[PDB]
Design an enzyme around this catalytic site. Structure first.
Site, short mmCIF file in Angstrom:
data_model
loop_
_atom_site.label_atom_id
_atom_site.label_comp_id
_atom_site.label_asym_id
_atom_site.label_seq_id
_atom_site.Cartn_x
_atom_site.Cartn_y
_atom_site.Cartn_z
N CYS A 147 3.82 -0.04 7.82
CA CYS A 147 3.80 -1.01 6.75
C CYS A 147 4.66 -2.19 7.16
CB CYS A 147 4.33 -0.28 5.47
SG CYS A 147 4.39 -1.15 3.84
N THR A 179 3.38 5.87 -3.54
CA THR A 179 4.67 5.84 -4.29
C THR A 179 5.66 4.80 -3.77
OG1 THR A 179 5.62 7.48 -2.70
CG2 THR A 179 4.54 8.36 -4.70
N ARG A 180 6.48 4.31 -4.73
CA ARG A 180 7.63 3.42 -4.38
C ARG A 180 8.77 3.88 -5.27
NH1 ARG A 180 4.78 1.94 -0.97
NH2 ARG A 180 4.43 -0.19 -0.07
N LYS A 236 9.28 -2.72 -7.07
CA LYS A 236 9.71 -2.41 -8.37
C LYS A 236 9.80 -3.58 -9.34
CE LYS A 236 13.46 -0.98 -6.35
NZ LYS A 236 13.50 -1.82 -5.09
N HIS A 251 14.41 2.18 6.56
CA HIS A 251 14.54 0.80 6.07
C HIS A 251 15.10 -0.23 7.05
CE1 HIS A 251 14.62 -1.93 2.61
NE2 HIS A 251 15.78 -2.37 3.08
N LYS A 280 7.93 12.55 1.47
CA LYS A 280 7.79 11.21 2.13
C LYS A 280 9.19 10.69 2.53
CE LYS A 280 6.74 6.60 0.74
NZ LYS A 280 5.91 5.75 -0.28
N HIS A 333 0.84 -1.21 0.00
CA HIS A 333 0.00 0.00 0.00
C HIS A 333 0.88 1.26 0.00
CE1 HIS A 333 0.83 -0.27 4.40
NE2 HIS A 333 0.64 1.03 4.34
C1 LIG Z 1 6.95 1.24 3.85
C2 LIG Z 1 7.41 0.36 2.69
C3 LIG Z 1 8.12 0.94 1.69
C4 LIG Z 1 8.54 0.21 0.57
N1 LIG Z 1 9.31 0.83 -0.38
C5 LIG Z 1 9.69 0.13 -1.53
C6 LIG Z 1 10.25 0.80 -2.56
O1 LIG Z 1 10.38 2.08 -2.52
N2 LIG Z 1 10.56 0.06 -3.67
C7 LIG Z 1 10.37 -1.34 -3.76
O2 LIG Z 1 10.72 -1.92 -4.75
N3 LIG Z 1 9.79 -1.94 -2.72
C8 LIG Z 1 9.42 -1.23 -1.60
N4 LIG Z 1 8.74 -1.89 -0.63
C9 LIG Z 1 8.53 -3.41 -0.61
C10 LIG Z 1 7.31 -3.79 -1.38
O3 LIG Z 1 6.28 -2.87 -1.26
C11 LIG Z 1 6.93 -5.20 -1.01
O4 LIG Z 1 8.04 -6.04 -1.27
C12 LIG Z 1 5.83 -5.76 -1.88
O5 LIG Z 1 4.70 -4.93 -1.56
C13 LIG Z 1 5.44 -7.28 -1.48
O6 LIG Z 1 4.20 -7.53 -2.21
P1 LIG Z 1 3.41 -8.89 -1.89
O7 LIG Z 1 2.26 -8.83 -2.83
O8 LIG Z 1 4.47 -9.91 -1.61
O9 LIG Z 1 2.84 -8.60 -0.44
P2 LIG Z 1 1.47 -7.99 0.14
O10 LIG Z 1 1.10 -6.64 -0.54
O11 LIG Z 1 1.42 -8.00 1.61
O12 LIG Z 1 0.35 -9.04 -0.45
C14 LIG Z 1 0.08 -10.34 0.12
C15 LIG Z 1 -1.47 -10.36 0.02
O13 LIG Z 1 -1.81 -11.73 0.34
C16 LIG Z 1 -3.08 -11.67 1.06
N5 LIG Z 1 -3.22 -12.96 1.78
C17 LIG Z 1 -2.23 -13.51 2.60
N6 LIG Z 1 -2.71 -14.73 2.95
C18 LIG Z 1 -3.89 -14.98 2.38
C19 LIG Z 1 -4.74 -16.06 2.45
N7 LIG Z 1 -4.59 -17.09 3.28
N8 LIG Z 1 -5.86 -15.94 1.72
C20 LIG Z 1 -6.19 -14.88 0.98
N9 LIG Z 1 -5.34 -13.80 0.94
C21 LIG Z 1 -4.16 -13.93 1.65
C22 LIG Z 1 -2.93 -10.45 1.93
O14 LIG Z 1 -4.11 -10.02 2.53
C23 LIG Z 1 -2.15 -9.46 1.05
O15 LIG Z 1 -3.12 -8.66 0.32
C24 LIG Z 1 8.22 -1.17 0.45
C25 LIG Z 1 7.51 -1.71 1.47
C26 LIG Z 1 7.05 -1.01 2.59
C27 LIG Z 1 6.27 -1.66 3.75
#
Ligand SMILES: Cc1cc2nc3c(=O)[nH]c(=O)nc-3n(C[C@H](O)[C@H](O)[C@H](O)COP(=O)(O)OP(=O)(O)OC[C@H]3O[C@@H](n4cnc5c(N)ncnc54)[C@H](O)[C@@H]3O)c2cc1C
Ligand SMILES: [Cl-]
Ligand SMILES: [Cl-]
Ligand SMILES: [Cl-]
Ligand SMILES: [Cl-]
Ligand SMILES: [Cl-]
Ligand SMILES: [Cl-]
Ligand SMILES: [Cl-]
Length: 372
Positions: A307, A45-46, A340, A263, A259, A42
């Protein structure tokens, strides 16, 4: 072919997009509402960077991720990327500096190292110690993260995907004709399953024993009294390795302010136990660090945000097939730096699910380097 995608954060949404673009029937399942703020994806921006300090092996993957972000932007008409350049600040031997130079040299990327005097001339908004350096790259920039998340879902649905929200997946198992997925509400069946569960990965995939630790991290948005001197034209995205920790920030944008996040460190928690309250001392620490290196940025605090990161022991991602069931693939452990790569991770997951293999160079992110 039918695929079920479990979890519709950025990675699951990219995977639903990559599958539907191939003409594959895809049903995504997500436990919470669309584009919710309880996971890791969420925010508005990233950062995207190309001269990648974490390891040069990511450079061909982020380069393909750029190409796929451009394709996604063209197909949906949403504005997804603003290249601003990027600057990394640290001692000469900081990994942020060493690793970016190694990556850039290995991949022939334009970059510039500046000493403190030269960096203050180029970026007067930064206040650096005399012994620090700055490393500048051109292709870094801002992904408009929520625009990207929505784009994948819009274009996946245009190509036939079905996306279900408010559905928690309890488990899954092979059924002799594919997989059966059990939800809190009924069952669903597909040829293949992709798990992109984010910080909940060790719940769903408990019996795999993945080495994953979830961390709570903080972001602050502040308003300068002189915003124009913080705007993208004079202030690229930035990352800093300083005695107070590792931090990152963005130029001033309307309705976001400046923002700034931290890290490193951050409290070990689970998505159940995470503290959503951001304390006065936490706010004062962040603005105190920001005011040392970007003086005048924090005349007023606009917003604070929590986050989650999901860390591996080596801070490299994990993407692989399930060790017992070849009909199941998963990605996890993005270690604070995966967003990214979401477009190319969706490509890779769709290849692992449909073909059992990918031509993308993702070998170094498999299980193997973590084995005893
Ligand atoms: C503050 C912050 C800043 C960041 N900055 C950068 C950046 O500038 N650049 C960059 O490249 N990365 C950045 N990142 C990292 C990046 O945002 C994350 O690596 C990426 O969002 C991971 O995505 P995901 O879909 O793995 O995880 P998530 O978005 O957490 O998605 C997992 C989803 O699975 C769902 N779920 C889990 N289990 C179940 C289940 N049993 N049944 C149904 N649904 C389930 C959840 O509800 C969730 O929606 C940042 C992260 C944060 C917290
Ligand atoms: Cl641009
Ligand atoms: Cl620049
Ligand atoms: Cl069915
Ligand atoms: Cl000022
Ligand atoms: Cl707030
Ligand atoms: Cl993460
Ligand atoms: Cl396997």
């Amino acid at each position: 072919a039918t695929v079920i995608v479990v979890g519709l954060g950025i990675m699951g949404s990219a995977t639903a997009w990559a599958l539907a673009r191939r003409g594959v029937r895809v049903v995504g399942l997500e436990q919470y509402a669309p584009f919710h703020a309880l996971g890791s994806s969420h925010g508005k921006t990233r950062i995207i960077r190309e001269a990648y300090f974490e390891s040069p092996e990511y450079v061909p993957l982020v380069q393909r991720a750029y190409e796929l972000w451009d394709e996604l932007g063209e197909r949906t008409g949403r504005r997804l990327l603003r290249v601003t350049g990027g600057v990394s600040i640290g001692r000469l031997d900081s990994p942020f500096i060493v690793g970016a130079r190694e990556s850039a040299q290995r991949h022939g990327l334009a970059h510039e190292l500046l000493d403190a005097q030269e960096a203050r001339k180029r970026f007067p908004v930064l206040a650096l110690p005399d012994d620090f350096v700055a490393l500048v790259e051109g292709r870094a920039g801002i992904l408009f993260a929520e625009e990207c998340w929505r784009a994948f879902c819009e274009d996946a649905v245009r190509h036939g995907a079905e996306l279900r929200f408010g559905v928690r997946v309890h488990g899954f198992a092979p059924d002799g004709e594919g997989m059966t997925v059990e939800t809190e509400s009924g069952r669903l069946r597909a040829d293949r399953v992709v798990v992109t569960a984010g910080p909940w990965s060790t719940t769903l995939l408990a019996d795999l024993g993945l080495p994953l630790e979830v961390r709570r991290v903080l972001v602050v948005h502040v308003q300068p009294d002189d915003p124009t001197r913080f705007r993208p034209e004079v202030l690229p995205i930035f990352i800093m390795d300083v005695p107070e920790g590792e931090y990152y920030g963005f130029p001033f944008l309307p309705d976001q302010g400046v923002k700034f996040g931290r890290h490193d460190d951050g409290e070990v928690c689970t998505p159940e136990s995470v503290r959503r309250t951001v304390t006065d001392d936490e706010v004062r620490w962040m603005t105190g660090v920001l005011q040392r290196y970007l003086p005048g940025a924090a005349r007023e605090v606009l917003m604070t945000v929590t986050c989650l990161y999901t860390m591996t022991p080596d801070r490299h991602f994990m993407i692989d097939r399930h060790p017992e069931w070849p009909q199941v693939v998963f990605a996890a452990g993005f270690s604070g730096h995966g967003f990214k790569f979401a477009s190319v991770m969706g490509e890779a997951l769709a290849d692992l699910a449909l073909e059992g293999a990918s031509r993308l160079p993702i070998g170094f992110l498999s299980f193997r380097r973590l084995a005893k």
